[PDB]
């Protein structure tokens, strides 16, 4: 996260770290959506241009974390993967359309003060909150700058941007399954996701029921926190049917 701040303890209890087993390293962010399901970006697991194609046994999920590199004894929980599900129409060839994946845990994680699932939006919360100017919150352990690395989880609040401004900021083809967020050059303020924040959540707190909802997944950006560029996020509500179909069929 660029130009963010240290998270508060327990501020993002749905935050998940995807961790490579050997070499032991951060692979991506992710989020907890129930005691056995974790949501992330498909490109965190499958991206053939970079020879990335991870299998269940290649990875671990670390939940309840704050510190990036420490083993947070008696706080974090580490889970193994039972199965990965990538959207069948994820477009890694072109523009990362439908950049979404689900991971089912081998065993349920115990909720705690530090471990708690985020809500996924229904149509009405989506329609109400996904408006230009409305702000969401992005969290992650990725780079602090486009190229150090953070000691602890980083947070930044960023406004959703008008679809024409998103489109005009890039040569990549944008789809309805994406939205972009970030400040404009004339807004003063700045901040962005960066490498390592991929797969983490974009969340909004509903003013109707005071619950947090995950509206986006950190997907892609050209650079990090560059003026006149914006972070792009998978539109979670647009892919809800697929999420539901996976969890309904595979439990």
């Amino acid at each position: 996260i660029v130009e963010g701040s240290d998270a508060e303890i327990g501020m993002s209890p749905w935050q998940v770290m995807l961790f490579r087993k050997s070499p032991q390293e951060l692979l991506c962010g992710a989020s907890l959506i129930s005691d056995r399901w974790v949501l992330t970006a498909a490109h965190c697991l499958l991206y053939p241009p970079w020879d990335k194609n991870f299998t269940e046994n290649d990875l671990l999920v670390r939940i309840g974390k704050h510190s990036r590199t420490r083993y947070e004894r008696n706080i974090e929980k580490i889970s193994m993967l039972e199965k990965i599900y990538i959207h069948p129409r994820y477009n890694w060839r072109e523009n990362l359309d439908r950049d979404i994946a689900l991971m089912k845990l081998k065993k349920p994680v115990a909720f705690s003060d530090y471990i708690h699932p985020v809500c996924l939006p229904d149509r009405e919360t989506a329609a109400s909150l996904l408006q230009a100017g409305y702000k969401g919150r992005v969290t992650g352990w990725g780079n602090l700058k486009e190229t150090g690395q953070p000691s602890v989880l980083q947070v930044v609040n960023l406004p959703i941007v008008e679809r024409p401004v998103c489109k005009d900021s890039t040569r990549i083809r944008i789809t309805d399954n994406m939205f972009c967020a970030g400040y404009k050059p004339d807004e003063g303020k700045r901040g962005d996701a960066c490498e390592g924040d991929s797969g983490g959540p974009f969340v909004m707190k509903s003013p109707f029921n005071n619950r947090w909802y995950q509206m986006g997944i950190v997907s892609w950006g050209e650079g990090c926190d560059r003026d006149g560029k914006y972070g792009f996020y998978t539109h979670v509500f647009r892919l809800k049917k697929w999420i539901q179909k996976v969890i309904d069929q595979f439990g």
Binding site: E8, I9, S112, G133, Y134, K135, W212
Partner: peptide, 28 residues
């Protein structure tokens, strides 16, 4: 599930985090 999105150390205790009001104020 039924309790999703309510954080133990904030909403469940009626405590606010230091920047959530920035989000609320943008919901115009």
């Amino acid at each position: 599930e039924a309790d999703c999105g309510l954080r133990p150390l904030f909403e469940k205790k009626s405590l606010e985090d230091k920047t959530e009001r920035e989000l609320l104020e943008s919901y115009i």
